[PDB]
Chains A and B, each alone.
With several copies, the nearest count.
Chain A
């Protein structure tokens, strides 16, 4: 078995090339990072493999940069090290159940030095609870599954440039050393040919000013920069002569009007760029500066601040960039090339992931803790001080909890299905806190860059206004320590391809010559041809003689994402439809049944197992007993492992999650094998739709303009039924007038309406609820007014008192139905954590079962969306020569216009998978199947094939497969050599005059359903202040009437309609009351007059002492 996975059902594959390396664990980006931050042995073992001499945890690094704290006497100090975590509070499922946060407590070992005494006191400090990541790669904050998204930033470093001038028509080279945190330094050559440094956006001064300011005598400047002419000219053009005269000059251009001392200037120059605390490069910035200047390449420098020798190296580099010199060398440093950098290139864009992002919040919170500890150690007594009293845990707990609450980069997990979640976690986002703005990013930042090849997917992106700003991590790509994205290659030493693979970054790859995975290879690894096609430098493609070939790609699908990877015949679509296809797959609703696609990519078993929603088997053993609730496995060791299966969970996006034990009882299960089938998964496989019999033609304008005709058989068989689970929540919070309560009796509601509720006040489980019904019965203690006299007689005749309580009971919003599957309640007595000031919270789950119908969205895999405009009854669909009616009728006119014919090929191949085939192999193998794999010569009906991306069935192979389709159970053969069949018309009963193209396709039911997206509103509830109808889909708000609809109105000349919309339908209260009343009464609606708004405009203009009068025809006021 070529497949790694233990018991995976096998797909014959149209694979022409063997894959050298297997696809890594997909959630690696999400787990690795966090594993590094906590500091765990697993990450320590990885660092053992890399051979890193420095083994350090993210927490440990933040503790080194804080320690030690010391008082300005130095007489008392406090440092702490060695974090360690503990067992998690509780298991994950319980945390999703009880609304808490799955986390672990965390200590440190802190000590208090004392100098005058000489005694140091050590102890264990606790540091709140710390949110910990689960094995699925997600965080559980407040009971909901969230996800931290990685972020693309420009790394710290030293960027040279060249900008053309408008006035003098000549380009000017400017550098900037941009650090991790600390003041911007920058150097720049002028149109007047004068270098100028600029320090924290100060006014330019000559650059030999700062050079002299560090301690450079005039003679050393003369000899070091002597070969350069513009540097010499800038040593003349300067005015300040001498060392302190330049520190004084720098202080005098730093701030104007401040007392200038020589010691404070010499103190701030080394305070802003050489002080360890005030300014910092990270390991990213330090390493990159070392690599760009070619200095200190042998030894790993632990010092992470800017140095002076470095700054002189930079100014010499800038002068080199003005020269046009290819090579620089510095004393004490290896040689490097000289070229201007580019901010778009992916070797400069580092990516900071969950570990970095959580580390930053721990850091900032920690700083806010350090100030408090410093003041606290000055005030307290030296004898009565303990390391317990100084450290305050609260300001950091606050920082983390606010990161997971508020931070843009920790969203709700998109859980439409498995593929959507797995894609959500592999995301490269450009937006957020600490990055370029959405309006600030130019149009070049947003497009594809020739260095993304194999790291970020060029195809996959969002379609709206965030295009280019969110990409997705490629299949094979993985992120190294510093924060760059690497892709694996294999290396060809001398025209022979190795089996050892090296992960390259974007800037290291620019230095070689990389050949593509389609190069013809012998069995030794010898190159079959004289010339190979290769990628050289940036955005260059060219043929090369076989000796200049250094590396080669892992797999022909190295450059795509995980969602893109599941589109059969993807090299046949265009990028637009490919984009809508990738995009749309992550909005497919999981059905009640799953089947895998008859034609798919090798990608779906791997994707499914990784995205975490199938239950896998940890060890190997034998199935003890199967339930609907749990599987019990018996290890060969002797110990038993029991797995739960959560049944009908409300996932985040209202769809249903269900786990179904797939194995039969008493079986032998391998370690790491699928055992249960999550939502959307069949047999451990990403199944986002169903197989349907499609025929391509227009059919009496019911599918005209991209709508779709569905066969009624689907609605009767439940082929496209889904389960959607809602939840509603209401609670009992205290008001000063009294404490509300949730209780069965409710004033002025008949007994039949209250039959569903029990004695508790909550509806019993399983009672189908039509909208408007009561789910939870609560009453507020009504605000104490006087009892109305008219109401004293009205209530007096019957004798029913309006009690001290009004009725605020939870009701069913309109457009929902289904059963009440489960209720849940939180109380003060149970000891449940509650929000501050509420005594009981109650939620209720209602689950309906949707059949497909008009106005639901369907989509294939190549971005061919569509709404169902009709559902014919079974006996009207154009049916096949043997009486199988087609299921869906997809129009012809949208295939050649979209310019994506992958769907036609998917249909042909699909029909061949349905019927099975047997090539003519008795006479010999026919030529068109020479390179066809041997397992493919002969398939059994309904056999599932696989065709990878950029390496699937070719044309000649498909066409040849359409001649060998197995004949039908009646004896006959239904589709011809072209793929077209003869159809009978269901209504007429004649045969159609030509052959139509039938076949199978894989269709998915998207998440745009007509029951969600329907709102109407005759009247409703308004908003006190804006006095317009209150918006929202959940309060059946009114729909908005913008400005271009008014211009339409006025182009018609429809004065009365537009005057009606703008006045009685929105703003005037008098108007709406009069119109409503007149309609109910059955009289004419009043003719629209002057808005009540007018008199308010006049009262406000009368407020500003202006005087506005209205003139009549004659000229007299009114």
Chain B
């Protein structure tokens, strides 16, 4: 990022803006699977919404090389990138 911030400003969000920040919707209450200790599909830890676990790896195992940057796997939908995005992509919930 550019090194030049004149000033910071804060405000209120909007549902039409909170939908913009988000990468998926968490709709299942469940966290990581108990057996294998991988995250559970479409919940508070899943790789689809947030990020892959190890660096440059999808979920099912159809890609574990580094040659493919930025591709989205069509069998499970995770994206092979650095695992550091695992702390920059935000979820969203839609309340009835």
A–B contact, 8 Å CB criterion (strictly below)? yes
Residue ranges of A at the interface with B (Cβ–Cβ < 8 Å): 1089-1090, 1095-1096, 1099, 1101-1103, 1105-1113, 1115, 1118
A1109 touches B9 (CB 8 A): yes
Q: Which residues of B contact A1103 (CB under 8 A)?
A: 90
Q: Which residues of B contact A1108 (CB under 8 A)?
A: 8-11
Q: Which residues of A contact B10 (CB under 8 A)?
A: 1101, 1106-1108
B21 touches A1102 (CB 8 A): yes
Cβ distance A1055 to chain B, nearest Cβ, rounded Å: 13
With A1107-B11, A1107-B17, A1111-B8: A1102-B90 Cβ-Cβ less than 8 Å: yes
Q: Which residues of B contact A1113 (CB under 8 A)?
A: 4, 6
**B13 at interface, CB cutoff 8 A:** yes
Which B-chain residue is minimally distant from A1069 (CB atoms)? B84
Cβ distance B23 to chain A, nearest Cβ, rounded Å: 13
Contact with A along B1-25 (1 / 0, CB 8 A): 1111111111111100110010000
B13 touches A1111 (CB 8 A): no
28 A–B contacts from the bound complex (CB under 8 Å): A1089-B3, A1090-B1, A1096-B87, A1099-B87, A1101-B10, A1102-B21, A1102-B90, A1106-B10, A1106-B12, A1106-B13, A1107-B10, A1107-B11, A1107-B12, A1107-B13, A1107-B17, A1108-B9, A1108-B10, A1109-B11, A1110-B8, A1111-B5, A1111-B6, A1111-B7, A1112-B2, A1112-B4, A1112-B6, A1113-B6, A1115-B6, A1118-B5
Cβ distance A38 to chain B, nearest Cβ, rounded Å: 54
**B88 at interface, CB cutoff 8 A:** yes
Q: Which residues of A contact B7 (CB under 8 A)?
A: 1111
With A1096-B87, A1099-B90, A1105-B18: A1118-B9 Cβ-Cβ less than 8 Å: no
Which B-chain residue is minimally distant from A1113 (CB atoms)? B6
Q: Which residues of A contact B1 (CB under 8 A)?
A: 1090, 1118
A1090 touches B8 (CB 8 A): no
Cβ distance A1106 to chain B, nearest Cβ, rounded Å: 6
Query: How many residues of B sit at the interface, in one of the four size bands?
Result: 20 to 34
Partner of A1099 from B2, B5, B88 at Cβ < 8 Å:
B88
A1099-B90, A1108-B8 known, 11 other contacts, Cβ within 8 Å = A1096-B87, A1099-B88, A1105-B12, A1106-B10, A1107-B14, A1109-B9, A1111-B6, A1112-B2, A1112-B4, A1113-B4, A1115-B6
Q: Which residues of B contact A1115 (CB under 8 A)?
A: 6
Q: Which residues of A contact B14 (CB under 8 A)?
A: 1107
A1112 touches B87 (CB 8 A): no
Which B-chain residue is minimally distant from A1118 (CB atoms)? B2
Closest 3 pairs between A and B when the two form their complex, measured CB to CB: A1107-B13, A1105-B13, A1107-B11
Q: Which residues of A contact B11 (CB under 8 A)?
A: 1106-1109
Cβ distance A737 to chain B, nearest Cβ, rounded Å: 14
Q: Which residues of B contact A1105 (CB under 8 A)?
A: 12-13, 18
B4 touches A1090 (CB 8 A): no
Cβ distance B22 to chain A, nearest Cβ, rounded Å: 11
Q: Which residues of chain B from 38 to 73 have a CB within 8 Å of any chain A CB? A: none
Cβ distance A1026 to chain B, nearest Cβ, rounded Å: 15
Which B-chain residue is minimally distant from A1114 (CB atoms)? B6
A1107, A1113, A1115 pick with most chain B CB within 10 angstroms: A1107
With A1106-B10, A1106-B11, A1107-B10: A1112-B90 Cβ-Cβ less than 8 Å: no
Cβ distance B64 to chain A, nearest Cβ, rounded Å: 9
B3 touches A1090 (CB 8 A): yes
Q: Which residues of A contact B17 (CB under 8 A)?
A: 1107
Which A-chain residue is minimally distant from B12 (CB atoms)? A1107
Cβ distance B3 to chain A, nearest Cβ, rounded Å: 6
Which B-chain residue is minimally distant from A1106 (CB atoms)? B10
Cβ distance B12 to chain A, nearest Cβ, rounded Å: 6
A1110 touches B90 (CB 8 A): no
Which B-chain residue is minimally distant from A1108 (CB atoms)? B10
A1111 touches B87 (CB 8 A): no
Q: Which residues of A contact B5 (CB under 8 A)?
A: 1110-1112, 1118
Cβ distance B54 to chain A, nearest Cβ, rounded Å: 10
With A1112-B2, A1113-B6, A1118-B1: A1095-B13 Cβ-Cβ less than 8 Å: no
Which B-chain residue is minimally distant from A1088 (CB atoms)? B3
Q: Which residues of B contact A1111 (CB under 8 A)?
A: 5-9
Q: Which residues of B contact A1110 (CB under 8 A)?
A: 5, 8
